Ligand binder design. Structure first.
Ligand SMILES: CC(C)(C#Cc1ccc(-c2ccc(Cl)c3c(NS(C)(=O)=O)nn(CC(F)(F)F)c23)c([C@H](Cc2cc(F)cc(F)c2)NC(=O)Cn2nc(C(F)(F)F)c3c2C(F)(F)[C@@H]2C[C@H]32)n1)S(C)(=O)=O
Ligand SMILES: CC(C)(C#Cc1ccc(-c2ccc(Cl)c3c(NS(C)(=O)=O)nn(CC(F)(F)F)c23)c([C@H](Cc2cc(F)cc(F)c2)NC(=O)Cn2nc(C(F)(F)F)c3c2C(F)(F)[C@@H]2C[C@H]32)n1)S(C)(=O)=O
Ligand SMILES: CC(C)(C#Cc1ccc(-c2ccc(Cl)c3c(NS(C)(=O)=O)nn(CC(F)(F)F)c23)c([C@H](Cc2cc(F)cc(F)c2)NC(=O)Cn2nc(C(F)(F)F)c3c2C(F)(F)[C@@H]2C[C@H]32)n1)S(C)(=O)=O
Ligand SMILES: CC(C)(C#Cc1ccc(-c2ccc(Cl)c3c(NS(C)(=O)=O)nn(CC(F)(F)F)c23)c([C@H](Cc2cc(F)cc(F)c2)NC(=O)Cn2nc(C(F)(F)F)c3c2C(F)(F)[C@@H]2C[C@H]32)n1)S(C)(=O)=O
Ligand SMILES: CC(C)(C#Cc1ccc(-c2ccc(Cl)c3c(NS(C)(=O)=O)nn(CC(F)(F)F)c23)c([C@H](Cc2cc(F)cc(F)c2)NC(=O)Cn2nc(C(F)(F)F)c3c2C(F)(F)[C@@H]2C[C@H]32)n1)S(C)(=O)=O
Ligand SMILES: CC(C)(C#Cc1ccc(-c2ccc(Cl)c3c(NS(C)(=O)=O)nn(CC(F)(F)F)c23)c([C@H](Cc2cc(F)cc(F)c2)NC(=O)Cn2nc(C(F)(F)F)c3c2C(F)(F)[C@@H]2C[C@H]32)n1)S(C)(=O)=O
Lengths: 206, 195, 206, 195, 195, 206
């Protein structure tokens, strides 16, 4: 990473990333973990992290195709001894050296190729998280003997993995959460009506 | 975090927070653990920690609604090129502010401590979650007839933690001993007397 | 902690304290562990450590009442832009900010509120260690088939948890150790008489 | 390593490399792990890491023979008191050079990066080892009749990693779905279609 | 410890010492572990490490009595506002000295190294404990008739560690081989001969 | 160690050495582990590391006799307020203080007593690795149903533990490897003839 001087990847940062994917796969928390463990990363560090992912090579190829899509858009938007202009392949670290990546990231002003690449990767990880969610939000309904908290847990766990704006996800919640509570809770919830906080809803259905 | 220069979140700090929620859920010790592990945190760091919470998404939405309540109050109380702008509640929560803006606010002279402000909102929300997930009222904590007094007091204050009654809820044999001490006994004296 | 500048609690120091209490409860070694892990701690750090204690809330309330006792004694002894005088509640961190605690601890000369509070806590932990010792020293007697070393181990393990001066504890040893050895060892021990070292006693009864 | 001053190898860096070979042998992720854990390494550090590999001594001799091939090519391309001498291939590999000579080359103005050069030779050898120890050809990766498409693609690119065909090797039901998409489908579209 | 400025004891240094006593008790390797983990330690640090020893309180009282013996000898050999006072044995052991006094002695020009002095007393006591807890005399270590020579030598020097005889205590078949070598054989020659 | 100022042994370096010997004993990888974990070590650090070795006291006495041999050779070759000349016992740290060892190692120019001692120890460890190898190279022969890679693994594992020059070990390989392959592979190997790489041999016998 760049901390401005270049620094070696630490073994613990690398191991922390491998362990996250091993234990959580592509649960939504992989994205905050990747962003935090990739703080300051060069494109070379980013490629190291992705290359250490064990298995899940279908998702990694999907990630690659997302990167190629974003690099093509970068090239569309941005066609001796001096700083080169980075193309998409440079940002992805396929056609650029570490020395060039350091030069871009530490220049005044910088071309933050590490942050640009990280954005493309996170977009790819968002797609993977959506693709690998085992549930769809229309199928989350409160069981007749499921505590309301357990149902809300399942609801937002599913909604968390979908790829959409926060405002879009909130519309889905207003459309489905109370409506798919079980009969006894749904009537209590509708009696409270809109504007009830989730805290108030959970107290009323406990 | 900011320690003023910005530093990356530490991998151990990150893992420590995930592990605490994994192992203890929302027992009351999650609050001091969060406060200690979020020392110096930016709003981006704070959203990172909260986003790494596995499961418990009902609690996390409740936390989100507490943050929005506090952000709305911030906006009620606090409604140029190259100059520093005034943070809204959404800026403090990190939904409409960049990391550079957060660093700028947090390191300014004088600082707008958006990380500390957001952390206060989060801890208020965590307090609500700890209360919500406590399974028992203090009224229902009563010493069993064969329960050692120390175990009963352990359950009592563990329950109070998440929220004269100690004497009233003791079992008949110990209540008689405790009443004979007279009011004003220390807990150590009560525990010695009913040992 | 203060190391003079303030520094964040480290996750490992915090975890080390939680693990000590988890594994040892209120064995006497909790006190050296707490003192070492709380080196440089502010009252806020000290409250963080105590608040992370899992369970044992009876002891924690007893600790609280010891702190309130000491703070009341501090207040009895010690009734723009300048340094405030700390009351007992300030030292315990209930009515003081971290900024004020840093100010006291780094002042020239300092009001060492962290060390003062730590003293009150350790006094409280000493009480808890005494209260939670499962044995009393009068009940430690060498079995007819217990090796002398095992008996001495049990004797000093019990004496270690009692709350008393070192000179008082040494008086109890002179009163009880040889006297409560089993018949065969007690005669050998008395034959050596006083002034024998524990090394010499253990050789003579092995 | 050199970070320019020479530093001792870290015990965690050392253990991390031993553990990776212990747990994953020569799966393809050994290459990025070696490259990351050998950041800044001298040839002495690199020989230390390789000498700590437990077992797999056939692979290690193959690595040795790759290094000698590259060293011979270096000598083909690049054949005074107190002055700095020109490194041979054996000097870059650390068989005939001292640590002080390696430090001198690596820190000179301009530097002869013997650590980076040796690391390139080693990674070329590790690439050969990864290929040799892959048990399967991509031609033999075909979707089972009850195999979910995602599991098949997982095996496919895991196999390719160590080395239109994806469509041809899919099972009849999915191949029909994939052909109906027309050429040019993204992998995400193929995976959605055969989900 | 002092590294000169005073530093807090490290949590890992602390845990490393507790773990060593937990796992190996008072096998001889406890001595080098204590010496290494007490590098730079003040008398307060040294009392902290010793106070964290779990169990083994008979050994710890023996250690205490050794310290008092050495402290009495110190007082036999070495019997003003703002000035530095002369440390007694109790000051070196940390029973009558403050941390600031210990820091003052240890960092003075020239220093009174009370931490190193106390550490020598402690190691003398630990040596006594290692001897006391060794269960066997070297006279009772003899090679079994089916015991490989290497295992016997392992037991032999492990026993000597805690405290011609090697030849005399070997079994008849190996003793004959060793006598035929003649005196002056290295241990490697003896081990090769009786392999 | 010396990093030029003296520094305490780190607990993790020490634990890493103890764990290596615990898990690997005197497999050949003990030597690179010892050399890396002893980087910068004083003779006192080196004695600390060797003294923490659990068990294996026969090898440790053999190591001691190797050190005494090398120290005797050093003494043969190298018979107020100024720097003392180190004898072999000084280099081994038996008759020298840490202060003297620091003085030698940090002098201008240095007497690198830490590196000298480390050389003697590694020579001793080489002997121990050879002595404790459970196989001899003449006994490594490819089974009739052993994959060629498994046989080569066993061959070089055995050869790795022998104490000899690399050129000597390579002569043993040319003398024995193909010659002790099983009949079917040996004929394929001889058909390729000399100059075949091990990669080519392993492909031809797979
Ligand atoms: C080891 C080291 C020295 C290095 C490097 C290194 C250098 C560059 C690149 C790279 C980066 C971005 C793109 Cl977009 C492409 C590209 N896009 S392209 C031109 O259209 O094919 N190609 N490349 C290879 C390049 F540059 F060589 F051309 C890349 C990689 C990627 C990093 C990566 C890993 C990952 F998991 C997911 C990603 F999105 C990106 N790793 C690979 O690609 C390895 N891989 N191999 C194959 C296959 F076998 F099928 F072919 C497959 C992968 C895969 F990606 F995992 C995915 C399953 C398919 N690593 S290091 C620094 O890590 O120590
Ligand atoms: C990954 C990364 C790059 C980032 C970021 C990032 C950026 C901003 C915000 C955020 C912060 C504060 C508020 Cl108040 C809102 C808000 N309030 S609002 C406008 O009224 O909806 N919205 N946001 C999203 C924003 F900004 F996009 F709008 C936020 C988040 C939160 C952080 C957070 C996590 C948490 F657990 C509890 C919290 F209180 C806050 N995370 C999410 O919200 C994710 N999430 N998604 C849903 C879903 F919609 F599915 F139901 C749900 C959550 C949930 F919160 F967990 C809860 C279960 C419901 N993260 S990073 C820095 O972590 O690396
Ligand atoms: C989370 C965070 C932000 C903070 C803080 C924070 C701030 C202040 C204080 C505090 C400190 C000292 C005293 Cl004397 C009192 C006091 N004495 S009093 C006026 O006479 O009641 N009160 N306080 C609360 C105050 F200040 F709010 F008033 C305190 C605490 C204590 C710290 C503490 C924990 C502990 F284990 C043992 C201690 F001796 C002290 N924690 C609590 O008290 C929590 N607790 N709650 C209850 C109960 F539910 F029964 F009520 C019970 C406890 C308990 F102590 F554990 C014990 C079982 C009984 N923590 S942080 C920095 O940790 O991240
Ligand atoms: C311990 C320490 C102080 C050191 C050093 C040290 C110094 C130099 C070298 C070395 C480096 C490069 C080449 Cl190309 C040759 C070479 N090529 S050659 C002239 O044509 O034979 N020889 N050397 C030995 C040299 F220099 F002595 F000549 C080397 C090694 C290698 C490092 C290495 C390990 C590895 F796994 C794979 C590698 F590619 C390189 N280690 C060995 O070779 C050990 N080894 N032994 C044999 C045996 F002979 F038994 F079959 C075998 C190996 C083996 F390689 F593992 C492989 C299975 C065969 N280590 S340290 C710094 O680690 O602390
Ligand atoms: C907690 C903390 C704040 C502190 C401190 C603190 C301060 C001073 C001392 C101390 C040091 C040296 C000597 Cl010579 C004597 C002494 N010699 S004497 C006058 O002749 O009695 N006395 N002391 C106590 C003093 F100073 F108070 F007087 C000491 C101790 C010792 C440290 C120690 C532990 C150990 F294991 C072995 C040692 F050799 C020394 N610990 C104790 O003695 C505790 N202990 N208690 C008893 C009991 F009485 F129950 F039998 C027993 C012990 C025991 F030693 F373990 C042994 C089994 C017997 N610790 S901290 C810095 O650790 O955070
Ligand atoms: C604890 C501490 C403060 C210290 C120190 C300390 C100081 C010096 C020395 C030492 C160093 C080198 C030589 Cl050559 C001799 C020597 N050679 S000699 C004159 O011809 O006998 N003697 N010494 C002891 C000296 F100096 F005291 F004389 C040494 C040792 C050795 C270090 C060592 C350990 C090891 F494993 C292997 C080694 F090659 C060297 N440790 C011992 O020798 C302990 N030991 N004891 C016996 C026995 F019981 F049989 F006797 C046996 C050993 C043994 F070596 F393990 C081997 C099984 C036989 N340690 S510390 C810094 O570690 O914290």
């Amino acid at each position: 990473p760049i901390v401005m001087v270049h620094q070696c990847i630490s073994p613990r940062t690398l191991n922390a990333w491998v362990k996250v994917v091993e234990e959580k796969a592509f649960s939504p928390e992989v994205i905050p973990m990747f962003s935090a463990l990739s703080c300051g990363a060069t494109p070379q560090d980013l490629n190291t992290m992705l290359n250490t992912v064990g298995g899940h090579q279908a998702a990694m190829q999907m990630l690659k195709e997302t990167i190629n899509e974003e690099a093509a858009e970068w090239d569309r938007l941005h066609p001796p001894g001096q700083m080169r202009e980075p193309r998409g392949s440079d940002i992805a670290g396929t056609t650029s050296t570490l020395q060039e990546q350091i030069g871009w990231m530490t220049h005044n002003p910088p071309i933050p190729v590490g942050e640009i690449y990280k954005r493309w990767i996170i977009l790819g990880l968002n797609k993977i998280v959506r693709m690998y969610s085992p549930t769809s939000i229309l199928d989350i309904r409160q069981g007749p003997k499921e505590p309301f908290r357990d149902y809300v847990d399942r609801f937002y766990k599913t909604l968390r993995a979908e790829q959409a704006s926060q405002e879009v996800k909130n519309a889905a919640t207003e459309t489905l959460l109370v409506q798919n509570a079980n009969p006894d809770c749904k009537t209590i919830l509708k009696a409270l009506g809109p504007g009830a906080t989730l805290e108030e809803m959970m107290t009323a259905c406990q």
